[PDB]
Amino acid sequence: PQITLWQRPLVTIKIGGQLKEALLDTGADDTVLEEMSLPGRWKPKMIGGIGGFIKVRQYDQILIEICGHKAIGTVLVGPTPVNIIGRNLLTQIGCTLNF
Amino acid sequence: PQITLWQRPLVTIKIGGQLKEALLDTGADDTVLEEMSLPGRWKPKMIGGIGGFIKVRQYDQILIEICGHKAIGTVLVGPTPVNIIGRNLLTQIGCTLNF
Numbered sequence: 001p002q003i004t005l006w007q008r009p010l011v012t013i014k015i016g017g018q019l020k021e022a023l024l025d026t027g028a029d030d031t032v033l034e035e036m037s038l039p040g041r042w043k044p045k046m047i048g049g050i051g052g053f054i055k056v057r058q059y060d061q062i063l064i065e066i067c068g069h070k071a072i073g074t075v076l077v078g079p080t081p082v083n084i085i086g087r088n089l090l091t092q093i094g095c096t097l098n099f
Numbered sequence: 100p101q102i103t104l105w106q107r108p109l110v111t112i113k114i115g116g117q118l119k120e121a122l123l124d125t126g127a128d129d130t131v132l133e134e135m136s137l138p139g140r141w142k143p144k145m146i147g148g149i150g151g152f153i154k155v156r157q158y159d160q161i162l163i164e165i166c167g168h169k170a171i172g173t174v175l176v177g178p179t180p181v182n183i184i185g186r187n188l189l190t191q192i193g194c195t196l197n198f
């Protein structure tokens with residue numbers, strides 16, 4: 001798809017069998033989702049953005065579908081205001097910025 | 100142009116005759132630039148990112164040129180680590196996310 005930006009670029013993703021809405025974010029290096037239980041062992045991690053750092057659980061090799069495209073990568077779970085799909089998964093689905 | 104996301108999408112912008120590097124961010128609703136003295140009055144404002152809120156100065160009707168493309172809109176100036184070009188300006192240059 002070609003997504004314009006007059007509105008936030010939110011899309012439906014499927015992860016752990018659940019549908020969730022998430023923001024395509026070229027400014028985020030990582031993918032950070034709201035608190036949820038995923039299978040797998042996880043590692044504590046710290047990530048920062050404007051405002052500061054937050055503690056997150058790092059899950060590796062998680063399967064996630066973004067608008068039907070499959071991606072398998074690291075997903076951070078923690079107290080984010082909104083679900084964010086960062087560059088580690090946007091590259092996997094072949095997403096580019098264009099003008 | 101088409102910018103891939105292997106690396107952070109940093110591009111050259113020009114504002115008030117000064118060239119600067121800035122991040123194209125579909126996740127940012129606003130444009131936030133590193134501290135700088137712009138003429139004009141401004142309004143105080145608080146914006147939140149991942150770890151919390153920061154105080155910024157809002158300036159209106161600022162002209163920025165992004166890869167030869169002019170945009171004019173509100174810019175927030177505050178102690179950010181990187182200049183962020185948000186959606187309010189990205190839409191003006193016809194920037195789309197494509198996959």
Ligand SMILES: Cc1c(O)cccc1C(=O)N[C@@H](CSc1ccccc1)[C@H](O)CN1C[C@H]2CCCC[C@H]2C[C@H]1C(=O)NC(C)(C)C
Pocket residue numbers: 025026027028029030031032047048049050080081082084086124126127128129130131146147148149180181183185
């Ligand atoms: C989540 C994340 C990472 O995993 C790794 C690197 C950066 C980020 C990150 O938070 N990036 C942000 C840019 S701010 C930024 C700060 C430093 C470096 C690069 C970008 C997001 O792209 C945009 N970010 C998306 C999202 C983050 C959760 C809170 C709600 C928005 C807030 C918005 C944001 O911060 N907006 C401002 C107007 C304050 C700029």
